[PDB]
Write a protein that binds this ligand. Structure first.
Ligand SMILES: CC(=O)SCCNC(=O)CCNC(=O)[C@H](O)C(C)(C)COP(=O)(O)OP(=O)(O)OC[C@H]1O[C@@H](n2cnc3c(N)ncnc32)[C@H](O)[C@@H]1OP(=O)(O)O
Ligand SMILES: CC(=O)SCCNC(=O)CCNC(=O)[C@H](O)C(C)(C)COP(=O)(O)OP(=O)(O)OC[C@H]1O[C@@H](n2cnc3c(N)ncnc32)[C@H](O)[C@@H]1OP(=O)(O)O
Ligand SMILES: CC(=O)SCCNC(=O)CCNC(=O)[C@H](O)C(C)(C)COP(=O)(O)OP(=O)(O)OC[C@H]1O[C@@H](n2cnc3c(N)ncnc32)[C@H](O)[C@@H]1OP(=O)(O)O
Lengths: 158, 158, 158
């Protein structure tokens, strides 16, 4: 059996992440979305909000579950007994921080594989930072994110 | 007529920008330098100062106008009725980012073209960030910027 | 004689820099590890702590000495009378930033050469930032740093 763990800040989750999750839920028996606290990033949404938004966006996929965590990813992946890390690779960078992330996690969790997917072309170039900045200036982001996310961002900047 | 809009933070405008603007005024009938507030960047100079510096550096160019804006670029370009985005490309450098930026603005402003110029060999490798940091440590920055900008940098840290 | 200066924040110094330093001490008569204050990065360790960790890690190399500084690199290098800048490329970070750095320093210190080494494959993916983050979450970092650094990181986070 394969259990893949998709770790990220998801602030917020976008159509880019969702495409990747869609594809991964058809490949693997179990997909865990691991939302990291990432306090250093000063996230726009709270961990609970990010987990909840990610849950809403994935509610239709039976083998996908969402959980938040504040610990070391290499510890958390053993705790989840997942044998595969999922990360998305868009163009291009980083990427190289992803190569660096994978090689450092290989030392800390040797039995976990690091694997990459690339999003549909249509949802590449979608970045959570840019979704946030467009929303904060009142731009329409409905083509970059799910409607609950769009609503959450709109209400957030009021 | 083409009305080209060149949007940046310009903190401060450098000889790299100035080169691009010289080149852009020779290609297009109307060039608007759109100086972004960019509060996330915590600019060294105020928007009002950054606009005054850009005005000073381009006042000799009759088809070039400068304005500050704090709104969504995709909204502001319509209020300005420009049909072309100008951006500069240097060493890699923030080049992925220009594709992603262009991609997302093509969704938000479908009718506006996105185009790129490159500055002379001589003004590549000039970053407004390194100019700020060198000046803040009392390094001589006069060879990276126009003289009014050099004075403002000197006065900025006294 | 060649006197090479190796500047960085070294927060903290890793086996990644130590490999570069080892290689440099066998090429040059004199190697200076220049630790930058870098107040903006808000370093985990104080300047004085980072200088001490760097001394501990290199004290077995007689031609290598460590010093801290808070001034402009281009002036400090004149103070140390070094004619060579050493910079490492922690794999493929942004050699374009190192270029922008080198050519701007070419303007401020024309008599100093910029030179680059790459670390052994084994240490080319160690990031002091990620070491700080793994250590802060109680992860084992003994495979990325010298034992004094591991001890120092351990004491820093309980
Ligand atoms: C060696 C190690 O163990 S690392 C030690 C430090 N920390 C930890 O262990 C705690 C765990 N931390 C994490 O899991 C984090 O998710 C990290 C460190 C893996 C990566 O940070 P992320 O949350 O993925 O955000 P990311 O680095 O991708 O930057 C956010 C951007 O990437 C996108 N993004 C966010 N999360 C992801 C993701 N999981 N996968 C792909 N893309 C993502 C967003 O669209 C966003 O767009 P932007 O570039 O304009 O901002
Ligand atoms: C979807 C989107 O378009 S964003 C939606 C939300 N935000 C907005 O709408 C705000 C609208 N304004 C903007 O987004 C800003 O103008 C931006 C990001 C397009 C431009 O910001 P920038 O000026 O490029 O800041 P940035 O630091 O990234 O500049 C990169 C480098 O190129 C130089 N530079 C500054 N402005 C420009 C410019 N317009 N073009 C080319 N180079 C520039 C600088 O010297 C800078 O050097 P540095 O990185 O060492 O500081
Ligand atoms: C040089 C000029 O005058 S331009 C103005 C800039 N600054 C000054 O004048 C003051 C002097 N400042 C310095 O010397 C600084 O060290 C700098 C800006 C030149 C370099 O900063 P860095 O120490 O490389 O820090 P960086 O932002 O890359 O982050 C530290 C990382 O760099 C790595 N690192 C630090 N120094 C080096 C180095 N000399 N070579 C290769 N890698 C390095 C570490 O692996 C660490 O890993 P990380 O990216 O995961 O955190």
């Amino acid at each position: 059996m394969n259990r893949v763990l998709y770790p990220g800040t998801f602030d917020p989750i976008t159509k880019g992440h969702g495409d990747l999750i869609e594809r991964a839920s058809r490949l693997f028996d179990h997909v865990i979305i691991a939302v990291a606290a990432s306090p250093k990033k000063n996230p726009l949404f709270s961990l609970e909000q990010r987990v909840a938004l990610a849950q809403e966006v994935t509610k239709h996929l039976p083998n996908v579950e969402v959980v938040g965590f504040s610990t070391l990813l290499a510890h958390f992946v053993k705790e989840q007994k997942a044998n595969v890390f999922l990360r998305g690779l868009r163009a291009v960078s980083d990427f190289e921080y992803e190569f660096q992330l994978a090689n450092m996690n290989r030392q800390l969790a040797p039995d976990v594989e690091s694997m990459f997917l690339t999003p549909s072309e249509k949802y590449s170039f979608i970045s959570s930072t840019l979704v946030r900045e467009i929303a904060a200036l009142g731009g329409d982001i409905s083509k970059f994110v799910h409607p609950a996310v769009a609503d959450a961002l709109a209400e957030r900047f009021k």
